[PDB]
Amino acid sequence: MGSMERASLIQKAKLAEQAERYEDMAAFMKGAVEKGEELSCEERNLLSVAYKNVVGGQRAAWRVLSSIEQKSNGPEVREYREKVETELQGVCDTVLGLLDSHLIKEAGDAESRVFYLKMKGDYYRYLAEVATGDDKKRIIDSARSAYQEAMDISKKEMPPTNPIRLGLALNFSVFHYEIANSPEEAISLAKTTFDEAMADLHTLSEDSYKDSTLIMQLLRDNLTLWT
Amino acid sequence: MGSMERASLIQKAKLAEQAERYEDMAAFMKGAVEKGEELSCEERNLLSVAYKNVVGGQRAAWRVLSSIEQKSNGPEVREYREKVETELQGVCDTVLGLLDSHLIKEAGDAESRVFYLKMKGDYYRYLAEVATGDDKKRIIDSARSAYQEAMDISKKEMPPTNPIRLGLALNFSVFHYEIANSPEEAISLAKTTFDEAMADLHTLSEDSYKDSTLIMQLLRDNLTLWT
Amino acid sequence: AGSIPGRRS
Amino acid sequence: AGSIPGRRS
Numbered sequence: 050m051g052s053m054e055r056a057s058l059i060q061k062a063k064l065a066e067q068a069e070r071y072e073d074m075a076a077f078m079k080g081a082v083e084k085g086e087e088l089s090c091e092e093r094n095l096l097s098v099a100y101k102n103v104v105g106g107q108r109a110a111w112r113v114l115s116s117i118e119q120k121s122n123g124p125e126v127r128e129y130r131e132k133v134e135t136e137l138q139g140v141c142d143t144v145l146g147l148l149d150s151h152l153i154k155e156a157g158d159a160e161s162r163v164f165y166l167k168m169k170g171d172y173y174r175y176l177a178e179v180a181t182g183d184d185k186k187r188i189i190d191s192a193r194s195a196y197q198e199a200m201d202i203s204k205k206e207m208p209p210t211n212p213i214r215l216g217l218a219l220n221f222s223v224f225h226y227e228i229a230n231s232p233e234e235a236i237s238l239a240k241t242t243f244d245e246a247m248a249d250l251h252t253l254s255e256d257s258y259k260d261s262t263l264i265m266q267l268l269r270d271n272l273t274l275w276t
Numbered sequence: 277m278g279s280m281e282r283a284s285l286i287q288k289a290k291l292a293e294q295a296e297r298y299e300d301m302a303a304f305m306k307g308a309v310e311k312g313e314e315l316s317c318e319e320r321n322l323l324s325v326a327y328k329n330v331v332g333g334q335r336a337a338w339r340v341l342s343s344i345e346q347k348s349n350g351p352e353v354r355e356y357r358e359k360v361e362t363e364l365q366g367v368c369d370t371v372l373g374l375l376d377s378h379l380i381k382e383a384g385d386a387e388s389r390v391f392y393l394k395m396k397g398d399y400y401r402y403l404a405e406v407a408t409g410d411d412k413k414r415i416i417d418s419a420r421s422a423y424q425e426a427m428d429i430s431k432k433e434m435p436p437t438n439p440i441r442l443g444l445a446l447n448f449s450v451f452h453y454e455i456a457n458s459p460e461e462a463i464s465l466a467k468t469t470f471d472e473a474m475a476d477l478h479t480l481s482e483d484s485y486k487d488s489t490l491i492m493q494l495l496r497d498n499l500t501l502w503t
Numbered sequence: 504a505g506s507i508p509g510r511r512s
Numbered sequence: 513a514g515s516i517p518g519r520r521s
């Protein structure tokens with residue numbers, strides 16, 4: 050996307066979102082990142098929406114195919130599951146590569162740094178969902194390390210109701226429950242996150258209250274399913 | 277897909293449908309067609325489902341972008357609408373090329389020939405939706421000619437409740453209403469098709485009755501919106 | 504209006 | 513269970 054203006058790539062990413070063309074949206078946002086400038090808050094959201102939709106479709110397909118393959122336990126189901134898996138891994142590697150070259154290293158404010166480290170944890174988590182054996186172990190530790198650095202910054206630098214802090218805690222709790230075989234850690238984190246946010250709601254405007262309570266409900270939903 | 281067995285391409289198309297990976301499904305079915313053998317009834321359905329989903333997503337995106345572009349009447353919205361339009365045209369040309377090389381010429385039974393000619397009318401109709409001016413005229417006549425040959429065969433060779441005959445009439449009526457500026461022809465065709473099917477329902481098994489009445493309801497739904 | 508949906512085998 | 517949906521800007 051090297052010949053397109055940065056501002057045009059951003060404009061086209063917004064149009065692609067409206068048209069539900071998420072692969073296009075991700076390509077436009079990759080082009081925008083590769084211009085080398087830092088991303089604004091809105092632009093970071095566009096990058097995340099684009100890739101979350103792309104990898105979300107891949108994960109759903111991988112789960113369908115993995116379930117068929119397990120039931121069957123010709124080569125076609127395994128071969129096709131492997132194809133989808135390789136494509137998913139390629140998208141995760143692309144996102145991780147954008148974060149490593151050079152979004153994280155240039156991110157000095159807490160909001161941007163926490164956002165990118167949460168993304169790094171998420172994309173290693175998606176790699177971990179399809180990994181097997183020893184490579185699973187190092188992938189899992191990479192996810193954990195990214196989430197932990199993000200958590201450490203968020204606790205020092207953001208209020209407990211900040212939506213990025215809340216979403217980070219939500220996703221790290223999912224990591225603990227689904228990836229790390231640590232359901233007690235997942236439950237503890239979701240409970241403490243919810244309780245500390247509830248005690249800070251009194252400080253918020255009506256609009257911020259809505260933003261924070263929406264994510265708090267997701268924490269509550271998980272706690273209900275896990276307990 | 278030249279190195280993959282025909283039977284494996286068909287198997288992978290079915291898996292891709294279950295995984296909602298319609299671009300993959302279309303590529304597998306294109307590979308199967310290019311093996312050069314005629315397609316069975318089930319295989320024809322797989323080909324149609326794959327491409328209808330691919331072009332359906334493109335048409336929905338084109339409509340979103342065309343509506344934004346008309347509201348605005350920078351170059352970005354037009355440029356992006358043009359990109360989507362060219363991709364849509366490429367998929368339609370691909371399908372039309374499969375039908376011309378050589379599905380239609382080898383299709384001798386009424387069920388296969390009508391099915392492919394209906395597809396030919398549909399894909400020219402999708403080209404007509406985005407065409408402007410004179411090229412619109414020849415595209416419209418190509419759609420009309422394909423639908424008309426299919427209608428002529430279906431009236432000679434199939435009962436009035438046959439689901440392909442019913443779906444052909446439904447789609448040709450949409451062509452008349454939406455493309456050809458002939459709403460009276462659309463209404464007449466839908467009414468006559470519905471009435472002739474209703475008089476033939478008594479001949480059908482319970483399962484065939486369900487198949488036919490489902491499409492008859494679509495004819496009725498259009499008539500309600502058009503009158 | 505509505506054509507054959509044709510999205511599901 | 514459920515992570516941040518994050519599908520809509």
Ligand SMILES: O=Cc1ccc([N+](=O)[O-])c(N2CCC[C@H](O)C2)c1
Pocket residue numbers: 328329330331332333334335336504505506508509510511
């Ligand atoms: O399988 C067929 C299929 C799949 C998805 C879509 N879509 O709207 O995304 C559609 N539309 C688009 C054009 C309008 C039409 O009435 C139906 C059809």
Ligand SMILES: O=Cc1ccc([N+](=O)[O-])c(N2CCC[C@H](O)C2)c1
Pocket residue numbers: 101102103104105106107108109513514515517518519520
């Ligand atoms: O934007 C995010 C997005 C988009 C589509 C899907 N999908 O299921 O297709 C998903 N899933 C897939 C994995 C399971 C997860 O709980 C959510 C997320």
